[PDB]
Design a binder for this molecule. Structure first.
Ligand SMILES: *[C@@H]1O[C@H](CO[C@@H]2O[C@@H](C)[C@@H](O)[C@@H](O)[C@@H]2O)[C@@H](O[C@@H]2O[C@H](CO)[C@@H](O[C@@H]3O[C@H](CO[C@H]4O[C@H](CO)[C@@H](O)[C@H](O)[C@@H]4O)[C@@H](O)[C@H](O)[C@@H]3O)[C@H](O)[C@H]2NC(C)=O)[C@H](O)[C@H]1NC(C)=O
Ligand code: D0W
Ligand code: NAG
Ligand code: CL
Ligand code: CL
Ligand code: ZN
Length: 586
């Protein structure tokens, strides 16, 4: 019994490496070269890996895990019993795989065109418009156009996707796909824990929201901003209003304390995408963590190709499951935002390398939020004015409370603004999956949540046939999103603990853990566990305690919360959006 199970897990691990490596290659080739051929080979490799999954998943289900002594072998076998889509009948599996590829392709090639004029892709063109335009009408053209071309085109696929992904989840013992996704956290109290964390961050978000709304009222006019209502969703510098830092110029608390133009500085100094990832590599190795192998530099696609290839430009990090081939694919733009993204992606690579000696079944983060947090932790240190100054991308900003509040505001526009967004994406999808939201009400329930959690409203009334969730990458690509909410909270807990381990004193937001070997050792021991143990053990290794907690993030931003409360009180802001029914008149 126990001996049969141990031999089984060894066989699974040997054959999975080979098959998973092959699948990763075909997926990479399509992702970096979208063609009918590569897409045909990908769909073919899909059926190959499903045959492997079905073979070993069927065997695994014949072990009564109850009678197993070893708990690492229990854990592997329990996971292999979940076939995911390979539980579907052959006909439905083929249809499911084609739906997913159609949704992804539709999103990745959509464009927004002027009549008799040029056509813009999402990256970099429309992203640039949303980030830099300060004209209501031009922002509206891009915001609405993307949803008209991308979102509306996904709607035809989504109901059938939902049916098929739920059917697979039921065939694997879950009640629906959202149940399956939540189970990745192995945390029965997950929904209540996440709701508690969201509530703890509400005071900070409402004060930020009210301050930004006042600043938008100053620039865009009283006729277009209701100081007691939701904010129009196209004015926040980002296609999804998920991060707001690109409108820093409109909301700067102390314009008398200016910051160097970081994009001009990178360009003037000859930064390139390759330099951006090299600086990330240096930060990781400064902590005593691992460098990326030479192969990484040869096989990664670090900028939009120019040879006519259509590619999936959305950034991603790749494990090829042979312990040696790791890659990034990013249509990198030379700016500070993409430097942070490069650190994020390099954090996924670091995790891949740290757990590469585990059985492939356990080669995942302690939970998906952990995988997302590693690179962001380092990026918190990289983002400090003192570190950016040492890269020659800022002037000296120390010894100045004005510069200090400006910096906290810059960070808040990204980190705090993102909290409600990241919460609501899977609040919506979980209710789509459990049947609470039907295709009749997809879009209406999306905007009810955009209002309830982010206090945003659409600048143009939505009409039948709109499917604005489809205009957000992770929806047609079927990537769960709550990982990013968890990540944004726990990355501050990790930062706090690593700064304490590095001997930092004083305000948490001034800490920079560059070159701390004690910090790197905490992260390395946690990452090496992969998915071999419940995630509270990895939490304990990093922070000395087992819980998720908003306290670290609230401590980081405490000086800004104090300042915002004073400023909002002085101006008589009404926090929140009691006039929640308001929408733009024109
Ligand atoms: C429950 O079972 C697990 C798993 O046991 C292993 O996997 C099963 C399928 C069988 O093949 C067993 O024969 C295997 O041992 C046990 O976990 C292992 O415990 C041992 C200690 O007894 C650990 O051994 C350590 O390994 C270190 C490095 O090994 C890794 O690195 C090499 C080379 O890089 C890599 O190729 C290899 O695959 C390893 O992953 C070594 O430095 C150290 O000194 C020590 O020898 C081993 O790492 C554990 N594996 C895992 C996956 O956790 C449990 O001990 C067992 N529990 C009980 C109560 O018996
Ligand atoms: C399974 C695998 O093999 N590869 C996976 C990694 C893994 O799970 O192992 C992978 O590469 N996924 C791609 C995805 C890309 C990005 C993303 O989509 N981010 C979210 C949310 C966000 C926003 C701001 C921010 O600062 C941090 C996160 C968004 O932009 O909406 C783009 C920019 C950042 C990360 C990613 O890396 O998470
Ligand atoms: C792109 O894909 C085609 C097949 O669709 C292939 O012949 C070609 O070599 C690929 N190009 C690159 C750069 O991979
Ligand atoms: Cl939207
Ligand atoms: Cl997740
Ligand atoms: Zn990520």
């Amino acid at each position: 019994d126990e001996a049969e199970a141990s031999k089984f897990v060894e066989e699974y691990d040997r054959t999975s490496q080979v098959v998973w490596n092959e699948y990763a290659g075909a997926n990479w080739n399509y992702n970096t070269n979208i063609t009918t051929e590569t897409s045909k080979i990908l769909l073919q490799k899909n059926m190959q890996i499903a045959q492997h999954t079905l073979k070993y998943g069927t065997q695994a289900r014949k072990f009564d895990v109850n009678q197993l002594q070893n708990t690492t072998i229990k854990r592997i076998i329990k996971k292999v019993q979940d076939l995911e889509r390979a539980a579907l009948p052959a006909q439905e599996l083929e249809e499911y795989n084609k739906i997913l590829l159609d949704m992804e392709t539709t999103y990745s090639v959509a464009t927004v065109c002027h009549p008799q004029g040029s056509c813009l892709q999402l990256e970099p063109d429309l992203t640039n418009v949303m980030a830099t335009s300060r004209k209501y009408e031009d922002l509206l053209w891009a915001w609405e156009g993307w949803r008209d071309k991308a979102g509306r085109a996904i709607l035809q696929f989504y109901p059938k996707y939902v049916e098929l992904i739920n059917q697979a989840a039921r065939l694997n013992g879950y009640v629906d796909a959202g149940d399956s996704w939540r189970s990745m956290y192995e945390t029965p109290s997950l929904e209540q824990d996440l709701e508690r964390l969201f509530q703890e961050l509400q005071p900070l978000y409402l004060n930020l929201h009210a301050y930004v709304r006042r600043a938008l009222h100053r620039h865009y006019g009283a006729q277009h901003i209701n100081l007691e209502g939701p904010i129009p969703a196209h004015l926040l510098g980002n296609m999804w209003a998920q991060t707001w830092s690109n409108i820093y110029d409109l909301v700067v608390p102390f314009p008398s304390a200016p910051s160097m133009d970081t994009t001009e500085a990178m360009l003037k100094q000859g930064w390139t995408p390759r330099r951006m990832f090299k600086e990330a590599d240096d930060f990781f190795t400064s902590l005593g963590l691992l460098p990326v192998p030479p192969e990484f530099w040869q096989k990664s696609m670090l900028e939009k190709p120019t040879d006519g290839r259509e590619v999936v430009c959305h950034a991603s990090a790749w494990d090829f499951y042979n312990g040696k081939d790791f890659r990034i694919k990013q249509c990198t733009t030379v700016n500070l935002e993409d430097l942070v993204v490069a650190h994020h992606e390099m954090g996924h690579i670091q995790y891949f390398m740290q757990y590469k000696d585990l059985p492939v079944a356990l080669r995942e983060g302690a939970n998906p939020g952990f995988h997302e947090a590693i690179g962001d932790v380092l990026a918190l240190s990289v983002s400090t004015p003192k570190h950016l100054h040492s890269l020659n991308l800022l002037s000296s900003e120390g010894g100045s409370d004005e510069h200090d509040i400006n910096f906290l505001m810059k960070m808040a526009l990204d980190k705090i603004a993102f909290i409600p967004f990241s919460y609501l994406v899977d609040q919506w999808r979980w209710r789509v999956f459990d049947g609470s939201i039907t295709k009749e009400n997809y879009n209406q329930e999306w905007w009810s949540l955009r209002l309830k959690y982010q206090g945003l409203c659409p600048p143009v009334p939505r009409t039948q046939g709109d499917f604005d969730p489809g205009a957000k990458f992770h929806i047609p690509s079927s990537v769960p999103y709550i990982r990013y909410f968890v990540s944004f909270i726990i990355q501050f807990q990790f930062h706090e603990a690593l700064c304490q381990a590095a001997g930092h004193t004083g305000p948490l937001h001034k800490c920079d853990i560059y070159q701390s070997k004690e910090a790197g050792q905490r992260l390395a021991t946690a990452m090496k566990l992969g998915f071999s143990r419940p995630w509270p053990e990895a939490m304990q290794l990093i922070t000395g305690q087992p819980q998720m907690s908003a306290s670290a993030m609230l401590s980081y931003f405490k000086p800004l919360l104090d300042w915002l409360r004073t400023e909002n009180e002085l101006h008589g802001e009404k926090l929140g959006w009691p006039q929640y029914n308001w929408t733009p008149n024109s």
